[PDB]
């Protein structure tokens, strides 16, 4: 149950943050298509 979390890649998922931090943060930019 735990090993399959990382083996399938489900663990490697970004975590959402509130929009205020994103606006203040400069490193975060729209990913290209």
């Amino acid at each position: 149950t735990n090993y399959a979390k990382w083996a399938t890649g489900d663990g490697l998922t970004y975590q959402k943050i509130m929009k205020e931090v994103a606006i203040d943060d400069e490193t975060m930019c729209q990913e290209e298509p």
């Binding site: 959402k16 943050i17 929009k19 994103a22 606006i23 943060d25 975060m28």
Partner: peptide, 16 residues
């Protein structure tokens, strides 16, 4: 809205 992410920090955020 759009989506902006930081790959180095592994973060994402939705801009309305």
């Amino acid at each position: 809205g759009f989506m902006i992410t930081s790959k180095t920090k592994r973060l994402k955020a939705q801009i309305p």
